[PDB]
Every structure is written in C-alpha cells, then in structure tokens.
Motif scaffolding. Structure first.
Motif, PDB file in Angstrom:
ATOM      1  N   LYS A  12       7.228   5.921   3.754  1.00 30.44           N
ATOM      2  CA  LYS A  12       7.855   6.580   2.610  1.00 30.44           C
ATOM      3  C   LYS A  12       8.783   5.504   2.045  1.00 30.44           C
ATOM      4  O   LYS A  12       9.809   5.196   2.663  1.00 30.44           O
ATOM      5  CB  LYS A  12       8.647   7.831   3.055  1.00 30.44           C
ATOM      6  CG  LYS A  12       9.411   8.544   1.941  1.00 30.44           C
ATOM      7  CD  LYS A  12      10.250   9.674   2.508  1.00 30.44           C
ATOM      8  N   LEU A  13       8.391   4.879   0.918  1.00 32.06           N
ATOM      9  CA  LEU A  13       9.165   3.793   0.303  1.00 32.06           C
ATOM     10  C   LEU A  13      10.476   4.270  -0.345  1.00 32.06           C
ATOM     11  O   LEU A  13      11.351   3.454  -0.655  1.00 32.06           O
ATOM     12  CB  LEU A  13       8.310   2.977  -0.694  1.00 32.06           C
ATOM     13  CG  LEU A  13       7.112   2.201  -0.129  1.00 32.06           C
ATOM     14  CD1 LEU A  13       6.160   1.788  -1.232  1.00 32.06           C
ATOM     15  CD2 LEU A  13       7.544   0.998   0.720  1.00 32.06           C
ATOM     16  N   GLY A  14      10.605   5.580  -0.534  1.00 33.19           N
ATOM     17  CA  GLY A  14      11.796   6.172  -1.127  1.00 33.19           C
ATOM     18  C   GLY A  14      11.604   7.558  -1.697  1.00 33.19           C
ATOM     19  O   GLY A  14      10.479   8.059  -1.773  1.00 33.19           O
ATOM     20  N   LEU A  37      -3.836  -1.992   0.340  1.00 32.41           N
ATOM     21  CA  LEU A  37      -2.523  -1.385   0.342  1.00 32.41           C
ATOM     22  C   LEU A  37      -2.140  -0.965  -1.069  1.00 32.41           C
ATOM     23  O   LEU A  37      -2.178  -1.789  -1.991  1.00 32.41           O
ATOM     24  CB  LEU A  37      -1.514  -2.375   0.900  1.00 32.41           C
ATOM     25  CG  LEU A  37      -1.418  -2.441   2.402  1.00 32.41           C
ATOM     26  CD1 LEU A  37      -0.488  -3.546   2.818  1.00 32.41           C
ATOM     27  CD2 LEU A  37      -0.919  -1.138   2.961  1.00 32.41           C
ATOM     28  N   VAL A  38      -1.817   0.333  -1.250  1.00 36.46           N
ATOM     29  CA  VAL A  38      -1.461   0.887  -2.561  1.00 36.46           C
ATOM     30  C   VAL A  38      -0.102   1.593  -2.524  1.00 36.46           C
ATOM     31  O   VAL A  38       0.342   2.039  -1.459  1.00 36.46           O
ATOM     32  CB  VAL A  38      -2.583   1.783  -3.188  1.00 36.46           C
ATOM     33  CG1 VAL A  38      -3.911   1.046  -3.283  1.00 36.46           C
ATOM     34  CG2 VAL A  38      -2.755   3.094  -2.435  1.00 36.46           C
ATOM     35  N   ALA A  39       0.543   1.691  -3.703  1.00 33.84           N
ATOM     36  CA  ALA A  39       1.834   2.349  -3.925  1.00 33.84           C
ATOM     37  C   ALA A  39       1.615   3.643  -4.735  1.00 33.84           C
ATOM     38  O   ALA A  39       0.994   3.618  -5.810  1.00 33.84           O
ATOM     39  CB  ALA A  39       2.783   1.414  -4.653  1.00 33.84           C
ATOM     40  N   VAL A  40       2.095   4.778  -4.192  1.00 28.50           N
ATOM     41  CA  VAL A  40       1.889   6.099  -4.780  1.00 28.50           C
ATOM     42  C   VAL A  40       3.198   6.836  -5.073  1.00 28.50           C
ATOM     43  O   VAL A  40       3.982   7.086  -4.164  1.00 28.50           O
ATOM     44  CB  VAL A  40       0.923   6.960  -3.910  1.00 28.50           C
ATOM     45  CG1 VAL A  40       0.473   8.203  -4.659  1.00 28.50           C
ATOM     46  CG2 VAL A  40      -0.288   6.157  -3.460  1.00 28.50           C
ATOM     47  N   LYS A  41       3.411   7.200  -6.344  1.00 25.72           N
ATOM     48  CA  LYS A  41       4.555   7.987  -6.810  1.00 25.72           C
ATOM     49  C   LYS A  41       4.018   9.424  -6.955  1.00 25.72           C
ATOM     50  O   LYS A  41       3.027   9.651  -7.668  1.00 25.72           O
ATOM     51  CB  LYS A  41       5.069   7.429  -8.147  1.00 25.72           C
ATOM     52  CG  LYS A  41       6.352   8.057  -8.703  1.00 25.72           C
ATOM     53  CD  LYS A  41       6.708   7.415 -10.057  1.00 25.72           C
ATOM     54  CE  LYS A  41       8.010   7.904 -10.636  1.00 25.72           C
ATOM     55  NZ  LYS A  41       7.897   8.211 -12.088  1.00 25.72           N
ATOM     56  N   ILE A  42       4.597  10.372  -6.197  1.00 26.41           N
ATOM     57  CA  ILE A  42       4.107  11.761  -6.201  1.00 26.41           C
ATOM     58  C   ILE A  42       5.196  12.687  -6.676  1.00 26.41           C
ATOM     59  O   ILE A  42       6.328  12.612  -6.197  1.00 26.41           O
ATOM     60  CB  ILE A  42       3.513  12.229  -4.818  1.00 26.41           C
ATOM     61  CG1 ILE A  42       2.695  11.130  -4.102  1.00 26.41           C
ATOM     62  CG2 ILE A  42       2.671  13.506  -4.955  1.00 26.41           C
ATOM     63  CD1 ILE A  42       3.421  10.388  -3.040  1.00 26.41           C
ATOM     64  N   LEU A  43       4.841  13.574  -7.595  1.00 23.26           N
ATOM     65  CA  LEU A  43       5.728  14.565  -8.190  1.00 23.26           C
ATOM     66  C   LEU A  43       5.851  15.771  -7.248  1.00 23.26           C
ATOM     67  O   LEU A  43       4.846  16.222  -6.720  1.00 23.26           O
ATOM     68  CB  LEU A  43       5.114  14.975  -9.544  1.00 23.26           C
ATOM     69  CG  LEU A  43       6.004  15.562 -10.634  1.00 23.26           C
ATOM     70  CD1 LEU A  43       7.125  14.635 -11.009  1.00 23.26           C
ATOM     71  CD2 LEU A  43       5.182  15.861 -11.870  1.00 23.26           C
ATOM     72  N   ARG A  44       7.074  16.259  -7.002  1.00 23.33           N
ATOM     73  CA  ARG A  44       7.352  17.408  -6.131  1.00 23.33           C
ATOM     74  C   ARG A  44       6.770  18.726  -6.679  1.00 23.33           C
ATOM     75  O   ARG A  44       6.828  18.941  -7.886  1.00 23.33           O
ATOM     76  CB  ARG A  44       8.868  17.533  -5.869  1.00 23.33           C
ATOM     77  CG  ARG A  44       9.401  16.422  -4.958  1.00 23.33           C
ATOM     78  CD  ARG A  44      10.856  16.555  -4.555  1.00 23.33           C
ATOM     79  NE  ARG A  44      11.247  15.417  -3.723  1.00 23.33           N
ATOM     80  CZ  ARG A  44      12.485  15.162  -3.302  1.00 23.33           C
ATOM     81  NH1 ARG A  44      13.486  15.968  -3.631  1.00 23.33           N
ATOM     82  NH2 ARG A  44      12.729  14.096  -2.545  1.00 23.33           N
ATOM     83  N   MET A  90       3.306  -4.446  -4.128  1.00 27.70           N
ATOM     84  CA  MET A  90       3.852  -5.799  -4.031  1.00 27.70           C
ATOM     85  C   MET A  90       4.759  -5.878  -2.796  1.00 27.70           C
ATOM     86  O   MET A  90       5.892  -5.379  -2.815  1.00 27.70           O
ATOM     87  CB  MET A  90       4.599  -6.161  -5.325  1.00 27.70           C
ATOM     88  CG  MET A  90       3.836  -5.812  -6.589  1.00 27.70           C
ATOM     89  SD  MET A  90       2.324  -6.754  -6.881  1.00 27.70           S
ATOM     90  CE  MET A  90       3.002  -8.362  -7.238  1.00 27.70           C
ATOM     91  N   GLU A  91       4.226  -6.468  -1.706  1.00 28.68           N
ATOM     92  CA  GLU A  91       4.861  -6.592  -0.380  1.00 28.68           C
ATOM     93  C   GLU A  91       6.283  -7.179  -0.340  1.00 28.68           C
ATOM     94  O   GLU A  91       7.068  -6.760   0.507  1.00 28.68           O
ATOM     95  CB  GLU A  91       3.962  -7.394   0.574  1.00 28.68           C
ATOM     96  N   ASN A  92       6.617  -8.140  -1.213  1.00 21.06           N
ATOM     97  CA  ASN A  92       7.938  -8.776  -1.163  1.00 21.06           C
ATOM     98  C   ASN A  92       9.017  -8.118  -2.046  1.00 21.06           C
ATOM     99  O   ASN A  92      10.067  -8.720  -2.249  1.00 21.06           O
ATOM    100  CB  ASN A  92       7.833 -10.280  -1.446  1.00 21.06           C
ATOM    101  CG  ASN A  92       6.904 -10.988  -0.479  1.00 21.06           C
ATOM    102  OD1 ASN A  92       5.828 -11.468  -0.868  1.00 21.06           O
ATOM    103  ND2 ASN A  92       7.250 -10.995   0.816  1.00 21.06           N
ATOM    104  N   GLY A  93       8.778  -6.887  -2.499  1.00 17.45           N
ATOM    105  CA  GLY A  93       9.728  -6.114  -3.293  1.00 17.45           C
ATOM    106  C   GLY A  93      10.028  -6.698  -4.655  1.00 17.45           C
ATOM    107  O   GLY A  93       9.157  -7.341  -5.259  1.00 17.45           O
ATOM    108  N   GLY A 146       4.567 -10.511  -5.050  1.00 13.07           N
ATOM    109  CA  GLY A 146       3.434 -10.340  -4.144  1.00 13.07           C
ATOM    110  C   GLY A 146       3.123 -11.538  -3.279  1.00 13.07           C
ATOM    111  O   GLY A 146       3.997 -12.380  -3.042  1.00 13.07           O
ATOM    112  N   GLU A 147       1.873 -11.614  -2.774  1.00 13.21           N
ATOM    113  CA  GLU A 147       1.415 -12.729  -1.917  1.00 13.21           C
ATOM    114  C   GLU A 147       1.390 -14.024  -2.744  1.00 13.21           C
ATOM    115  O   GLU A 147       1.227 -13.956  -3.966  1.00 13.21           O
ATOM    116  CB  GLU A 147       0.032 -12.445  -1.288  1.00 13.21           C
TER     117      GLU A 147
END
Ligand code: 5X1
Length: 280
Positions: A12-14, A37-44, A90-93, A146-147
């Motif tokens: 959980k990235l945040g 590896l993917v980043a997912v923003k989910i609405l409550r 993006m692994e390195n923030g 990223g890398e």
C-alpha cells in the motif's frame, strides 16, 4: 477495460481522502504494449460524486499522454466500482527524494548525469507543448525516477503533505506553487507554454542544488509575490535565484533566459533540450 483479477497486491504506497494507492504485480502482459510492476490509484466505495467526477476527468486527460518521458496510463477499471487507474511504477520515487539522498561526484551523482536528468525533462515538456497542453505545476516533486536514471514527468496535484510548503493559498481563491510560477502567472493568472519554461528554469536550479534548498528559501511567500510586481515594474529591483555552487556560468545564463520578463524572449523546450544535450 482492465481485469481486476490480473492485479496482485504487493504494498500500500499510501492513502488519503476518497482513495488509496497500491503497488501490484501483472503476469504475462497481453493487455498493455518476470511479472510487470504497476501503480494503482483506487477510489473508495465511500467516495463522493465530486470525487468520482474528478477521477474520470483525470483519466480523460492522462489517456492522450503518450511519451517515453511522460507517465503512461496503462488502463482503468471504470465499468464497476471501486474505480481505479493503472500507471507505470517508478521504483526510485520522485526526483526530489532521489536527489536529496545523493551527493555530487549516500551514493554519488555526476554532473553529466544531472544534465541527462534535465534533458529528459525538456524532451518531455516539448511533447506536452506539441499537444498545446500546459502543465501548470512543473517541479522536481512532480518528476518520477525509474531504472537507469529514467525520468517520467507526472502531476500529484496537492495530495502529499510533504510538499505543503511549496504551495501558497490564497484561500479559497487558488492554492498555487508561486516559487515556480513566472511573474505573469502571479499577477494575471496567464499560464502558457512560455510560463512552463520559467518553471523548467526553477526545476533545473533545483537539480543543480541537488534538491537541497527551496527556491527563494530565505524570502516569505508575500516577498515572492512582491518580486513578481518588480518584474512587471521593470525598474531593476527584481531579484533572481542565485547560481548553484556546482553550476558553470554558462548553464546559469540558460536558467536566466527562462526568466526573461517577455515570454517571447524565453527559449522553447526544443532549444532547451538541444543545449542540455550538447553544452556541458
Ligand atoms: C497510480 C498513482 C501512483 N503513481 C506512482 C507512484 N509511485 C511510483 N510511480 C507511480 C503516480 C500516479 C499519477 C497520477 N496522475 C498523473 O501522473 C498526471 C495527471 C495529470 C492530470 N491531472 C493533474 C492533477 N490534477 C489534480 C488532476 C488532473 C497530468 C499529468 C501530466 F500532464 F503531467 F502528464 C500526469 C495518477 C495516479 C498515480
């Protein structure tokens, strides 16, 4: 749309109001263009109609943004609730945290590598201009790493408490990153590609400072607003960001050109990329 069954939770990235961000794994990618590896923003499922509306407006914008140096929208899960958006991870923030943790040549960073990071930023901003798209909030905090030192331009809005100080409100009226804004943005609210060049200038100053200090860090937010007034006044009371220690006068005069009172005199991104790629 994107199958939710194909998203495997990692971290959980945040979290925030109306949503939360997840880091997920996708096996054999035959949906996009050994698991990815993917980043997912989910609405409550508690999110308001105003929150739902903002999410779909943001998906609409991102769907057209297709460039190696811009964050890609891999897909969405809009057909059912909870709504979600899937981006590259993006692994390195962000570039600020990335640079803040490094020293110039705690790992090291070379001057040609600093320029190479600033070259990806110009090539990226060049693309959004060809789409006649104004970024409105370019800074290192809004750049992802990223890398192999890869930089992809993003936009977090005003969602992260870490950068609250970079924003000045103005209520009530408009929360703005004045320290990166050109004089015309402050006095009139005239955001253009020419004002993005001013923000790029300040961003390249950040990079050459290695994200060690905030622009005009000794001056108050009101004093910076005062300074926009002096650029319009043009009587010689206007001030500029000082030369970073690890910056030749050459590359410094480039930053200064991004800070021309006339937007016509400011150099475009095509020119800013070519200089950052050739002169060092
Ligand atoms: C998945 C989640 C986590 N993620 C991640 C975290 N850690 C490592 N890797 C990735 C990054 C991320 C980013 C976004 N949004 C964008 O990138 C962005 C959005 C717009 C338009 N909006 C601007 C803000 N405004 C309020 C509403 C409209 C502009 C642009 C551009 F023009 F600059 F390209 C890009 C959305 C979700 C996520």
């Amino acid at each position: 749309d994107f199958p939710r069954s194909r998203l495997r939770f990692k971290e959980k990235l945040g979290e925030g109001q109306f949503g939360e961000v997840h880091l997920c794994e996708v096996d054999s990618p035959q949906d996009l263009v050994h698991p990815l590896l993917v980043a997912v923003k989910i609405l409550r499922p508690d999110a308001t109609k105003n929150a739902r509306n903002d999410f779909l407006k943001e998906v609409k914008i991102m769907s057209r943004l297709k460039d190696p140096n811009i964050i890609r929208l891999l897909g969405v899960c809009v057909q059912d609730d909870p709504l979600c958006m899937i981006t590259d991870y993006m692994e390195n923030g962000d570039l600020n945290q990335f640079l803040s943790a490094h020293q110039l040549e705690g790992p090291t960073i070379s001057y040609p590598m600093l320029l190479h990071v600033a070259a990806q930023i110009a090539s990226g901003m060049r693309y959004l201009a060809t789409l006649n798209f104004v970024h409105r909030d370019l800074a290192t905090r809004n750049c992802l790493v990223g890398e192999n030192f890869t930089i992809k331009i993003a936009d977090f809005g005003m969602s992260r408490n870490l950068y609250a100080g970079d924003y000045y409100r103005v209520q009530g009226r408009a929360v703005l990153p004045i320290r990166w804004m050109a004089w015309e943005c402050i006095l009139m609210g005239k955001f253009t590609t020419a004002s993005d060049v001013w923000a790029f200038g300040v961003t390249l100053w950040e990079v050459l400072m290695l994200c060690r200090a905030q622009p005009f860090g000794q001056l108050t937010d009101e004093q910076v607003i005062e300074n926009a007034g002096e650029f319009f006044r043009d009587q010689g009371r206007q001030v500029y960001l000082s030369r970073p220690p690890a910056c030749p006068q050459g590359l410094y005069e480039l930053m200064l050109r991004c800070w021309s009172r006339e937007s016509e005199q400011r150099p475009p991104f095509s020119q800013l990329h070519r200089f950052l790629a050739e002169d060092a």
